[PDB]
């Protein structure tokens, strides 16, 4: 058919994304010299037509379709291996497969996933490389011009909170609750600007978030079921706090050590860093290759750090 | 042994199902003793394709790579520039297995509680809470570590060990594939470094005086692991971390391809802490190190520590923070 025929003509150019968490792979290519994107995703296991009430009686349900097993290794009560399972177009297909063609630049930009590098960012690196970049720098539309006011979940209005206040809105199933609190202060561009003197304010924000969010969802999510965190590097240089259901099943990098830092941890660390706060911290995090800071000095500094630590690397 | 045990598995119930990650856990029995099987679909594959050879990264020439193994396609529907369908792909034990399986047997109640679906709670654990609630539990828990000692002293998984640094003691460690890793796809590379010293049960036991030792472990790991895989992964592409609470009370360091977004909490803030961060934080805590820290983390409601005092203490913390009690109605 049409679909099969188009897939057969697909000429591979490059891999856009490979995600071992979700078992998704996206490929850039061409069909009739026009750009094309194929996305493939492994199917989930099947259950008989909570998860604790599912069943495994039917032919293709659960692990019933195993044709072949092979051990990797074992130890005491733990055994693990690999399996081949019977596939079938109607009852147990192997993967979902989508095609975008002709694909536009916007589609390609959407599906390309960048590579990351662990950097160790010292105070001096921040001052020399990062700080000047931040200064050279839609949030304001939301804060001061009413943009997306229909979507806002909570907003401070009183004169007392003109500076220390904030608003909360969703990020663009209750398990997948994901909100962002954007503060009214304009002098905090990243966690680097948090001083010891800001600690009580952060504690107050943490307490407000947990006092308010549950009531917005009729106490269907509890205050202790919110993973409240910030990012470094953040996606935008105006301080903001991510509020995520602790059970959110969707997420990978956005909640990962190396990117996300718990608000409670920010708070606790400010007891020890002295007056200038996170200005004094050496922060190890994952920086993306597409980020402007990579070529502005982080790459060069990482190679020097590896040399100092006596770590083997491939040269430039 | 493995195959034989899987074949005898009698299903009892589904413990958990995650369609995002394509992971499923099943409770059952083998010889009328409890057993847990966890299954995870494999990821897609790519080519395994001075006088040094660079690995050809993300290519699709080979038989089983990318979408070359498609035997059958079926369109669901299509519209405008979009086509949506399904595929059947050729499976093969050696070159394209369908799913990784883990088996725990005989499984203990602790294992079952761990894998059952449960609520999770962000807890704030103060030094006093550690001393009163957690520390006594650790002492009881230290049978459960039989697998660690098997690797260290009885040759278990010796064939897979990638690095071993041991003179006959307390300074050394070894590195091998973590039970999580299917051993085939480098995007999900996941290794565990197990230390030989036994006096460190968790990060709580790390003092300021342990800092240089941790720096040395970090350096060795990054100096060794990449060369084991022909630099298909670089030293700066390893997310190296520890867990609190860990499942097992023996200091273990998790080494994960940075490209792996992570199953459940294995790399998540609230569970995972970067080794570099452990190292850096020791500069600011006292001599007693993480014993002085208030540590906030995610714990499951079935964990033994929940009813042993963390639940009661979390309620009191919420009151002190002026967080409202949930109305009964
Ligand atoms: C019993 N066992 C557990 N692991 C891994 O050891 C690490 C233990 O680290 P942990 O943080 O205590 O466990 P958790 O992530 O479940 O909380 C985990 O990544 C397990 O996947 C294991 N890895 C190997 N190679 N062999 C084993 O017998 C074994
Ligand atoms: Cl068709």
CATH code of A98's domain: 3.30.200.40
Hey, what are A125's tokens? 């690196």
In a shared domain, residues B206 and B105? no
A275: CB partners within 8 A, 6+ apart: A195, A196, A197
* Separation between Cα atoms, residue B204 and residue B217, nearest integer Å: 18
Nearest CA distance, B106 vs chain A (angstrom): 6
CB of residue A75 inside a 6 A radius of ligand 1: yes
Distance CA A194, CA A8 (A): 55
- Ligand 1: does its nearest atom lie under 6 Å from the Cβ of B96? no
C-alpha of residue A4 to centroid of ligand 2, in Å: 7
Q: How far apart are CA A226 and CA A229, in angstroms?
A: 9
Q: Are residues A14 and A97 in the same domain?
A: yes
- Whether a cis peptide bond, with omega within 30° of 0, leads into B165 is no
Which chain A residue has the Cα nearest residue B157? A73
Secondary structure of chain A in the HEC alphabet?
Answer: CHHHHHHHHCEEEEEEEEECCCCEEEEEEEECCEEEEEEEEECCCCCCCCHHHCCCCCCCCCCCCEEEEEEEEEECCEEEEEEEECCECCCECCEEEEEECCCCHHHHHHHCCCCEEEEEECHHHHHHHHHHHHHHCCHHHHHHCCCCCCCCCEECCCHHHCCCCEEEEECCCHHHCEEEEEECCCCCCCHHHCCHHHHHHHHHHHHHHHHHHHHHCCCCCCHHHEEEEEECCCCCCCCEEEEEECCCCCCCHHHECCCEEEHHHHHHHCCCCCCCHHHHCCEEEEEECCCHHHHHHHHHHHHHHHHHCCCCCCCC
Question: Which CATH number characterizes residue B324's domain?
Answer: 3.30.428.10
B252 lines ligand 1 (CB under 6 A): yes
- Indicate whether B108 and B148 sit together in one domain: no
| Centroid of ligand 2 to alpha carbon of A94 (angstroms) | 16
- The count of structural domains within chain A is 2
| Contact present, B37 and B28 (Cβ < 8 Å) | yes
The residues near B313 (Cβ < 8 Å, ≥ 6 apart) are B123, B129, B133
Task: Write down how long chain A is.
Answer: 316
CA B188 to each of CA A23, A68, A71, A157: distance values in angstroms, whole numbers, following the listed order: 11, 23, 19, 47
CB nearest B37 (choices: A63, A87, A214): A63
Same domain, residue pair B201 and B304? yes
Neighbours of A174 (CB within 10 A): 12
Residue that is last in its domain, among B118, B140, B174: B118
Same-domain pairing of B200 and B290: yes
Residue in B11, B120, B157 nearest the CB of A75: B157
Whether residues B35 and B160 fall in one domain? no
Q: Which candidate from A69, A260, A306 shows the least CB-CB separation from B3?
A: A69
Distance CA A184, CA A167 (A): 8
State the Cα–Cα distance between residues A221 and A211, nearest whole angstrom.
11
Q: Is A140 exposed, middle or buried (0-12, 13-18, 19+ CB in 10 A)?
A: exposed
Closest-CA residue of chain A to B242: A257
Tell me the two tokens of residue A128: 């020399």
Ligand whose nearest atom lies closest to the CA of A5:
2
Q: Among B80, B219, B258, B244, which Cα is nearest to A289's?
A: B258
Contact A63 B26 (CB under 8 A): yes
In a shared domain, residues A45 and A124: no
Residues B75 and B156 in one domain: no
Final residue before a domain boundary, out of A61, A88, A114: A114
Among A280, A264, A260, A261, smallest CA distance to A272 is for: A280
Rounded Cα–Cα distance for residues A122 and A136 (Å): 21
Q: Is ligand 1 within 6 A of the CB of residue B192?
A: yes
CB contact under 8 A, B314 and A224: yes
Co-location of A235 and A291 in the same domain: yes
Length of chain B: 329
Question: Domain span at residue B138?
Answer: 119-329
- Number of the ligand closest to the Cα of B267: 1
Supply the residue whose CA is at minimum distance from atom 29 of ligand 1: B179
Domain boundary among B64, B90, B118: B118
Does residue B159 sit in helix, strand or coil? helix
Q: CA-to-CA distance for B46 and A16, rounded, in angstroms?
A: 13
Buried-state track A91-122, b at ≥16 Cβ within 10 A, e below 16: ebbbbbbbbbbebeeebbeebebeebbbbbbb
Residue B112 and residue B94 share a domain: yes
Q: How far apart (Å, rounded) are the C-alpha atoms in residues A278 and B98?
A: 47
Resolution in A: 2.2
d(CA B202, CA B297): 14
Listed residue (B150, B184, B153) closest to B168, CA to CA = B153
Residue A157 sits in the same domain as residue A49 = no
* Ligand 1 contacts CB of residue B147 (under 6 A): yes
**Cα B194 to chain centroid, rounded:** 13
Please state whether A60 falls in left (phi above 0), alpha (psi between -120 and 50) or beta.
alpha
Q: Which of B72, B46, B74 is nearest to B60 (CA)?
A: B46
Ligand nearest the Cα of residue B157 is 1
Q: A9, A314, A259, A300: which is closest to A118 by C-alpha?
A: A259
Task: Please check whether residue A15 is in contact with residue A108, taking contact to mean a CB–CB distance below 8 angstroms.
Answer: no
The answer to whether residues A259 and A231 touch, using CB atoms and an 8 Å cutoff, is yes
The Cα-based distances of A301 to A89, A234, A306, B115 in angstroms read 52, 20, 9, 43
Contact assessment for residue A242 and residue A262, using Cβ atoms and an 8 Å cutoff: no
Q: Are residues A68 and A123 in the same domain?
A: no
Q: Which residue in B has a C-alpha nearest to residue A80's C-alpha? A: B102
Residue carrying structure tokens 């039917």:
A58
């Amino acid at each position: 058919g049409m679909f099969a025929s188009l897939i057969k003509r697909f000429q591979f150019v490059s891999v856009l994304d490979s995600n071992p968490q979700t078992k998704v792979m996206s490929l850039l290519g061409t069909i009739d010299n026009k750009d094309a994107i194929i996305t493939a995703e492994k199917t989930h296991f099947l259950f008989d037509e909570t998860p604790v009430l599912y069943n495994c009686e039917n032919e293709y349900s659960c692990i019933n379709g195993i044709q072949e097993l092979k051990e990797i290794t074992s130890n005491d009560i733990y055994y693990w291996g690999l399996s081949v399972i019977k596939q079938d177009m109607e009852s147990n297909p192997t993967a979902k497969l989508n095609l975008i063609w002709p694909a536009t630049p916007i589609h390609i930009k959407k599906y390309e996933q960048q590579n990351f590098h662990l950097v160790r960012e010292t105070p001096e690196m921040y001052k020399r490389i990062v700080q000047p970049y931040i200064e050279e720098m839609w949030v304001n539309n939301i804060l001061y011009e009413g943009a997306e006011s229909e979507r806002v979940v909570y907003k401070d209005f009183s004169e007392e909170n003109k500076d220390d206040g904030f608003l909360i809105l969703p990020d663009m199933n209750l398990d997948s609750l994901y909100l962002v609190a954007i503060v009214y202060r304009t002098d905090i561009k990243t966690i680097r600007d948090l001083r010891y003197s800001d600690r009580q304010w952060l504690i107050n924000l943490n307490n407000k978030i947990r006092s308010i969010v549950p009531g917005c969802y009729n106490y269907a999510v509890h205050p202790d079921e919110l993973r409240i965190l910030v990012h470094y590097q953040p996606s935008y240089y105006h301080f903001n706090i991510h509020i995520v259901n602790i059970k959110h099943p969707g997420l990978g990098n956005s909640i990962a050590a190396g990117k996300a830092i718990l608000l409670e941890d920010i708070i606790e660390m400010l007891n020890y860093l002295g007056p200038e706060g996170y200005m004094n911290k050496t922060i190890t995090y994952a920086i993306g290759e597409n980020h402007d800071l990579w070529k502005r000095g982080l790459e060069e500094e990482l190679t020097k750090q590896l040399e100092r630590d006596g770590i083997p690397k491939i040269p430039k």
